[PDB]
């Protein structure tokens, strides 16, 4: 996995690649690593895939109830606090490494969370197996006072570094832009630079190729 | 980590590097290890980032609840709450914490809490992996009742050497000044402190 987060003028942007692996095998070539906690608070997850999905949904559920209870839009620090105290309780056995980002009445925010429950603040962050490739790009091209279009470019470039150089990362680039005063825009498959080339041959078999012993109609009705 | 806290004439100053380590990879080069648990009671964190964060948050909660009932807590009280957490959970924690605060009666105070969860009140304290390299320097150069400017220089020079020799320490030197005047934050960049 390669995931990044970048702060800009009037908000924050996060991005991720779309490869999921079991061992050296690519299980899913276009999975979604960008999760919604609340409408304007989004999460990028690396590590154990089930843990990142489960922990983001649980906190996302509790954040919704909290928002309804308090009649207030949810804050990023609340999601951060709930996630870290949950992860810390399980002593790293829940293998969720997250980049949390969003906007709220307080402003725009960007955090990372490690499996053991430690959090970090930053203007630019990267997690996952391709984080070193991504961070190299971020450390080279990041500056203060980035525009929206500059931050998206920087973020996706950082993901691309992971896609090309890290074997754990690949396929496409997903992006989500959270700007203050506006709706968050989720850009699924923002870049698709790994399209499969046309095959040399069609492997459509002549009908009857497969030997058959028995046929029977299956009853699905009541 | 490299961390320290030093008492002086007007109060106490906390100091720290900004390096967080996952192996030999620097996970965060701009970390803030100086942490508020009360208005004028702060702490320096070393060891496990997760453990020290979880402890600091619990202490902050305890002191906020203390303040609601009994008013401002003493620096000794804050150190006691840290100790209780570090001592009773010694088997599951890797946390080396220095507690520093300013009272008006007691002035500047420093308490260090090592791995075991023991408490030691000192004029100044050093901790973290990088502290090993400056025991000689700090012992020879520390004086009681220093001025603000002298104490800042003492911490700056000390952490500069700790950073120079310790691979696990680096980045910027953060400081927090605690006096009657209020709370002042200071930062010092490589280009300054490296060529000291």
């Amino acid at each position: 996995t390669t995931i990044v987060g970048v702060k800009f003028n009037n908000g924050v942007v996060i991005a991720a690649d779309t490869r999921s692996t079991q061992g050296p095998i690519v299980a899913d070539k276009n999975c979604a690593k960008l999760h919604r906690i609340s409408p304007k608070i989004w999460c990028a997850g690396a590590g154990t895939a089930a843990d990142t999905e489960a922990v983001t949904q649980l906190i996302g559920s509790n954040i919704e109830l909290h928002s309804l209870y308090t009649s207030r839009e949810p804050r990023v620090v609340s999601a951060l606090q709930m996630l870290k105290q949950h992860l810390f309780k399980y002593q790293g056995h829940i293998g969720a490494y997250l980049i949390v980002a969003g906007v709220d009445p307080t402003g725009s925010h960007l955090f990372s969370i490690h499996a053991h429950g430690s959090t970090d603040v930053g203007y630019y962050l990267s997690l996952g197996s391709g984080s070193l490739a991504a961070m190299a790009v971020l450390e080279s091209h990041w500056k203060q006072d980035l525009t929206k279009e500059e931050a998206i470019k920087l973020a996706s470039d950082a993901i691309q570094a992971g896609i090309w150089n890290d074997l754990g990362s690949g396929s496409n680039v997903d992006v989500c832009v959270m700007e203050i005063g506006k709706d968050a825009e989720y850009l699924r498959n923002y870049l698709t630079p790994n399209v499969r080339e046309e095959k040399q041959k069609s492997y459509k078999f002549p009908r009857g190729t497969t030997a058959v012993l028995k046929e029977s109609i299956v009853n699905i009705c009541d | 980590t490299s961390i320290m806290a030093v008492t002086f004439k007007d109060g106490v100053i906390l100091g720290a590097d900004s390096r967080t380590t996952t192996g030999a990879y620097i996970a965060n080069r701009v970390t803030d290890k100086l942490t508020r648990v009360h208005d004028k009671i702060w702490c320096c964190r070393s060891g496990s980032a997760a453990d020290t964060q979880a402890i600091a948050d619990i202490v902050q909660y305890h002191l906020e609840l203390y303040t609601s009932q009994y008013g401002t807590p003493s620096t000794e009280t804050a150190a006691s709450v840290f100790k209780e957490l570090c001592y009773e959970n010694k088997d599951n924690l890797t946390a080396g914490i220095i507690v520093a605060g300013y009272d008006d009666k007691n002035k500047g105070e420093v308490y260090t809490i090592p791995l075991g969860g023991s408490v030691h009140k000192l004029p100044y304290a050093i901790a973290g992996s990088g502290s090993t390299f400056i025991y000689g320097y700090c012992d020879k150069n520390f004086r009681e009742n220093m001025s603000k400017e002298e104490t800042v220089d003492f911490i700056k020079h000390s952490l500069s050497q700790a950073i120079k020799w310790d691979g696990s320490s680096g980045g910027v030197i953060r400081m927090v000044v605690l006096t009657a005047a209020g709370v002042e934050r200071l930062i010092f960049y490589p280009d300054e402190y490296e060529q000291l």
Binding site: G92, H114, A115, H116, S118 | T1, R19, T20, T21, T22, A27, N28, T31, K33, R45, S46, G47, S48, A49, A50, T52, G128, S168
Partner: peptide, 4 residues
């Protein structure tokens, strides 16, 4: 895990 992250150390300080």
């Amino acid at each position: 895990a992250p150390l300080x």
